[PDB]
């Protein structure tokens, strides 16, 4: 499923998959059914490492 609730307007409830025009249904890098812009910070480490940032081509916050 792209969406795990039937109430999510990004998917069709009947299919649980994205509607035409939607790039995503949930995830830290999904913004109103579109991919969040590339470089948007999505995870800030406790240690002295660079932030994870949205790639602009995935709904999830990458690990790297």
Curated annotation (Swiss-Prot):
It comes from the Eukaryota. A motif (Cell attachment site) lies at residues 46-48. Disulfide bonds join 1-16, 3-11, 10-33, 24-30, 29-54, 42-61. Residues 1-64 form the Disintegrin domain. Inhibits platelet aggregation induced by ADP, thrombin, platelet-activating factor and collagen. Acts by inhibiting fibrinogen interaction with platelet receptors alpha-IIb/beta-3 (ITGA2B/ITGB3). This is Disintegrin rhodostomin. The chain holds residues 411 to 474 of 478 of the full protein.
């Amino acid at each position: 499923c792209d969406c795990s609730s039937p109430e999510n307007p990004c998917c069709d409830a009947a299919t649980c998959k994205l509607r035409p025009g939607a790039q995503c249904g949930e995830g830290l890098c999904c913004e109103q059914c579109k991919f969040s812009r590339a470089g948007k910070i999505c995870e800030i480490p406790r240690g002295d490492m660079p932030d994870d940032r949205c790639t602009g081509q995935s709904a999830d916050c990458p690990r790297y």
